[model samples]
Target: DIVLTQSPKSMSMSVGEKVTLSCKASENVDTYVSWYQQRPEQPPALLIYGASNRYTGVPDRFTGSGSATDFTLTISSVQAEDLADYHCGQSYSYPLTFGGGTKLELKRADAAPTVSIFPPSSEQLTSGGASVVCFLNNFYPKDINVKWKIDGSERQNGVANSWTAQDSKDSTYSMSSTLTLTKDEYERHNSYTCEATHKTSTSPVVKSFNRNEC
Candidate 1:
């Protein structure tokens, strides 16, 4: 499958301003153009499709236009949260393809952050349950998403929380998530994964452990 390419391959913008990312294809791409936005360590979110249809849950500030070999994705009054990558794909045939992404930067990125999952200490395991904590330290861009899975399932025995705090009252942000599990679940040696996503990440930061590793 072949699709036309995109332009302004990278960009930087300020809050309250807008950015227009576009594509120009040789063969008419029709209206089956879909736009996607992504941040480092996160999933791609479909912003628009069929040339102009916005996906559910997407904000109206995001708009699309164009047909054939030309299409545009426009974001108005961009926010700190809008800084990331944008992609456009052609859905006309099998072996679908997308253009090289446009990296939208609010500012230059810092190095990826450090992550750690504090395994259940001995006492917690012996007490019929384990409390696990996954932490992201010294990270810029305060936004992040953390998810926990047990035995490949989302269900866990106890409560959970994600809280971000300042690192030494400095410019960076750090956060931690807590997942509690029952003794039966813990002893099963079930695989546990912590998926952490941040804007600077090109891929999700993942950590895994099991009862045996405790």
Candidate 2:
């Protein structure tokens, strides 16, 4: 079975903002779609099942709608505490599978946080080992996690991150993490991925870095 998960994978929105998470199936699914929320250090919770019906105890702020190949989950007045990852699965097929997860992150009241690769310039290529900072700043809501990978393999050693901090002016949250690579690794042109998981996001916010820039 195939599921067309939500596109953009991740998103950032401010308090009281509204957003719709989506899913599409490869074939007819009627009203057999379901949605679940996965939070940090917690088990997945079913929010909507059987397409439009809310699972028991699911809040009204959360809703599911759609049928067949297309489906959607809408959240009204997005809140910080409600921030988390959302998944869409199909029950119409023999082998059930889920759509790619989508991340819902708190948006910067001023604007989206500026996400960028550090050392803006070049020369890290000839410089042997280097540490890259997958930086996110000027955003909100402290709940977030960072995942690093190299050449499709999960990376851990030499990886470090920080807790989100609030902005004195607006009380928003911001944070960043680092990934270290050996000189040989960088020269191989391996793909480096950074995924920031925040409560506001339905999935982790992912960024891919290629060696061409190095």
Candidate 3:
């Protein structure tokens, strides 16, 4: 996913300060924009997409509306839940696209710190290596996954993974992955992959950094 990061440089906004993140398209994309907001210990809620439409099971406080090129995501009466990471994504493409994110904060001095995520980026390595462990690189899953692929074929059940839970302290179940080879499979160089998935339908999200020097 190509994420674009945006925020108020001053880190402050008035009670109704217009905080916006402009997500540009790389090329002609389909119509499937999705917005997500995350709070500590809580799952992310979808905000807007596909022509400013709200997702099912979302609140009225958050809304999305705008036309192509320039879109707007407004949070009516922003609350603490609206203050965490704000991610904008689109299912139009197979890989899916996401906006960097805007940290909504109260336009005051004594308010809580503005939560933000750095520009999201991950690299992929594809080669021929047996029993090779693919790296997720810098990303950890709020909802991540890892899958093993052999010569463009998907492997199931025959894998192991870890780290996916949101508990930062315990740091358990924080990411996902599957085992690549068994039966002396590591002896031969075979490319393997780990992909990240989210609430939206951008199946097999980002591919993991690959290695195949068996």
Candidate 4:
């Protein structure tokens, strides 16, 4: 897979300021680059396709430039409504890939997210297996890291995380991740933990589901 790396994972900007987002592919992708704008609760909107061609109805202020392995998405004058995540994608080869994403925020005080974990319901546990959910809310800048651990060991399989952070009404963001486990696996582990790390956080926020507590 061709990996696309985006820079400035999160950035704070003021309205009317010029903003530039960068995307670099592990290998050459030529001019088959595309850019998308993502707003909270809304589907991503394609802004630039075929490298620098503006998509239909897109404003002229949004420009795409670059070729080969490097790409740039520049906003001539950012608007308040332009506060959203930007992603770059490639179509140069099979197994298309996209960047990690760049979160654009209006300059303000950054806030760390509040984290919570919901244990599996009793009905679910009795049925067969269950899913544990970790929710983070009201964070600024949008970039965050969430991981699931069982007895201090990170769990990777059967995990599903929100593809993008949801923009909250207060200009912060929210996200959730779920870890599905089989009945046997759930019972075997004594502790399940959800860890959330944000740029504004002095330390990771962790919540645990102790099997013994039930």
Question: Which of candidates 1 and 3 is the stronger one according to TM-score?
Answer: 1
Better TM-score candidate (1, 4)? 4
Q: Per-model C-alpha lDDT, please?
A: 0.77, 0.75, 0.49, 0.87
Which of candidates 2 and 3 is the stronger one according to TM-score?
A: 2
Tens-digit lDDT track of model 4 for 1-214:
8999999798888889999999999888889999999987799999999889999999988999999988899899999889898999999888988889998877756888888899899999999988999888788766788988899999899899874444445666788899999988888888899998889868888898788995
| Candidate 2: RMSD to truth | 10.8
Candidate 2 residue spans exceeding 4 A from truth: 109-214
TM-score per prediction, in order, is 0.50, 0.56, 0.42, 0.62
> Residue 160 deviation, candidate 2, in Å?
10
lDDT of 4 at 200: 83
In candidate 4, position 3 carries an lDDT of: 95
Candidate 4 lDDT at 207 equals 90
Which residues of candidate 1, in runs, are more than 4 Å off? 107-214
* TM-score, predicted candidate 3 vs. hidden true structure: 0.42
Q: Pick the candidate with the highest lDDT.
A: 4
**lDDT tens readout by residue for model 2, 99-204:** 7798776555443455565632357646676777888776655555677877788878987776563553665766678877777665665577887766656766
Q: Give the per-residue lDDT digits (tens) of candidate 1, residues 37-134.
A: 89767999998989899999889889999988789988877976787788889888767888888877554345456888877887887777788888
* TM-score computed on alpha carbons, candidate 2: 0.56
Q: Which regions of candidate 3 are displaced past 4 Å?
A: 1-11, 14-21, 110-214
Candidate 4: C-alpha RMSD after superposition = 5.6
Candidate 4 weakest lDDT stretch, 10 residues: 163-172
